[model samples]
Target chain A: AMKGDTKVINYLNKLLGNELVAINQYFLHARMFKNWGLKRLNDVEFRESIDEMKHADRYIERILFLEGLPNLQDLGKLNIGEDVEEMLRSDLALELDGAKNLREAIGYADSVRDYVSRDMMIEILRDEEGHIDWLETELDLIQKMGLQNYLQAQIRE
Target chain B: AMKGDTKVINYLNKLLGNELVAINQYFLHARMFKNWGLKRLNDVEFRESIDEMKHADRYIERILFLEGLPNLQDLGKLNIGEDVEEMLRSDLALELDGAKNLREAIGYADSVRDYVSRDMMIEILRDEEGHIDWLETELDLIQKMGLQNYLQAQIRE
Candidate 1:
């Protein structure tokens, strides 16, 4: 039988599912970047996917530790865009969403006195902030330097 | 200092990268299935994506344990086709490729005296075999029953 609060368990699983969706979307974007010869962008996107995987794993482990059901079916909608600009904007939105969700998750964990989950969320929130910041910087650079110039400059071997 | 053989570490990393690519393709396929109103197909594809994630995690963990670089960059190409039949064929090819790679990996591990890695690959090989079998079965059904009837019959709430 499940031991932890089912409400929290479900919430965590929902977040985990969202992270999985993020991983999937980023992976597709990475492939796109690879095809376009944007090696730097592809590497970053792939690394972000790995980051999402870490978050998913943490959630799954916590659920197991709590003896709760791991429901991974509630994935977020994939919104990979048609072009680089749209892709970056979509990714930024998702990163912002993840940060917001983590904030809510932190609060929920605190309310339930789940210190371990709260601390984990806090750490992951830091990474999410970094992702948002990176996306924001990329967007700004594209606006200032123009897409072609920035993309050309970001190429990796 | 690293403990595991360098070749084994690199090989596992390569496999991890391929699994990551598989996850991306399957996730995209799932989204396509969802858009096509094939809920059952979407769910199955999504679950398969999750299974790939599990495989990737195991590879990454092993690499980390060996103190070797977790090279998650050498991704396999995305081969999601333009149509359902093409997609099935593409996925079948990929599954067969994975099963073949798993077999070779087991041989490599055995040559290196890495019984742990060999055993893990053996277990994963069973899952890959299942995936291949399922895809083959689905393809056969499509051939015999036709796509329209099969799709209609497999639809769910």
Candidate 2:
């Protein structure tokens, strides 16, 4: 078996790259928030962006301590939503995607002969379930709000 | 009350920043494995990271539709230790922190009359509970290794 340090360093470098790219995507979301009129939503999005940024920093610093260069990639920009309906739609989609991704990453880590990643995946799975539920709540709320308005307008008209 | 759009925008922007920063933290956890070995703890870390990133994305996209800027300063990092045992302990600490933050966020959403963010925070809280359980197990494992060992061999050594 490889030394403990080797095993640790190898994984840390790869993990850093993944986080950087993912965080970059979040930063893009922050940028998009500027275009929307919802200041509150923008604030939340920005908060999340920095949360990801901090995660990246922790990884980079740890890697450096291990005498490794962080193999971090620049953050990526992916356009996610066009409007409220689009946002809701994307929210549901992303939650579902997260569930799948966490599961796959965990399973893959397990296959590679590491229990840490696998265990981590399990934790992620739990969180993903909650996220899916949260998104569903938003979807239902949005739909319900629309219905409420529709009924009210019908009565007035 | 203010227009629905304005309220929704405010909440979503806040979510955007929080989610992004949270997700980045996950990726950072994943990257740390490179130095620590892709053990169960490392995997658990990344997995949690992934779930957080997913939430961040959802919040950001939702904010985008509201046309707002996600505030940048709100993504906060946790206080973690520098070694394996310290790392595991940090995991437990952060899990508890996640729980506290979720409640605070939920309260804020309610204060603002945003049921959407409030409901989302509930789910996030549930997930964080699960994280606590999982991380606590690891802490137990380390504890079983012996408190003296933990302090000397696992940490200070």
Candidate 3:
């Protein structure tokens, strides 16, 4: 196993906690979409939860590789919303918060000259950016087009 | 890629479709559990979704190894329900249906003398049985303990 600073491992574990919360939150929201008869959005949210699971697993593996025990117990807040519009807004907030957290972690990794951790976080950051972009686009559509119109496009036969 | 019988490959593709539906259905159900404040049940359902995803991926890999194209387009029915009792009943129906399908597939694979597919289906059948057992236990609890009491136990701190 590779060795790394305890601080770096701790930080990564914190991020893992965030991923855990995201995984659960996304899965929960996916169900809400399905309950609302939004199959397409349900599919998208379900995929995102899977992606968060992957992220959490990768972080766990990295912590193990560095001979650090992963703290999987702590999870971020579950901010699931009641309705479709609220759910989208909540999700958008989460994505933005995650991107911000990753950005800070990247700089911290760089400050410690931990290039391996930095590069790993950089990859994660890229995915976070994609999530943010997707959420932003969805929000944009709902704002520009009527909610009913946007939702009609999301419905499947 | 190892060569396998074309018929076995095609049958596996059909099984893949069921697993695909299961993956989505379990995920959506997990979200409903969460929304209903049943965190324990939500965790179980979420884990089940991950398990179904693994099953689907394995099937996809097997089909590809056999030099067959996976039919990812077809999906099984999503039988989610409005309330907790209804959801449990729907999931029970789904699991029973899956177990039945797997049993039939196992017999067919045996008749074809395709032990590889038969063995794979056997493994999948084991997991399906586990799912059925879990769902049955929950349903039984709900029946005996009263829905409100059973659900109260599902909440986490």
TM-score of each: 0.53, 0.47, 0.51
In angstroms, how far off is A30's CA in candidate 3?
1.3
Query: Candidate 1: which stretches are off by over 4 Å?
Result: A1-157
- Output the better candidate (1/2) by DockQ: 2
Mind giving the per-residue lDDT tens digits that candidate 3 earns over A1-157?
5788878888886787677557646755675576568897888888888788778667766776777754433342345564577788888888887778788888988999988888988988888787778778888999899788998888776
List A-chain TM-scores for all predictions.
0.91, 0.54, 0.90
For residues B1-157, write the lDDT of model 2, one tens digit per residue: 2234565565555555555545554454555654545455466777787777666656655554444545434344433345556655766665565566567667777887778657766776777787778778767866787754644443311
Q: Candidate 1 lDDT, tens digit per residue, A9-61?
A: 77786677668668867866776677678887888989998899788778867
lDDT of 3 at B81: 65
User: What's the best-to-worst order under DockQ?
Assistant: 2, 1, 3
Residue B118 error for model 3, in Å? 37
Interface RMSD of 2: 8.2
Q: Give the range where candidate 1 chain B is weakest over 10 consecutive residues by summed lDDT.
A: B69-78
- Top candidate (lDDT): 1
Span of 10 residues, lowest total lDDT, candidate 2 chain A: A148-157
Stretches of candidate 3 off by over 4 Å are A72-76, B1-157
Question: Over all chains combined, what TM-score does candidate 3 have?
Answer: 0.51
Report fnat for all candidates as fractions from 0 to 1: 0.00, 0.10, 0.00
Higher-ranked by DockQ: 1 or 3: 1
Worst 10 residues of 3 chain B by lDDT: B70-79
Global Cα lDDT for candidate 3: 0.74
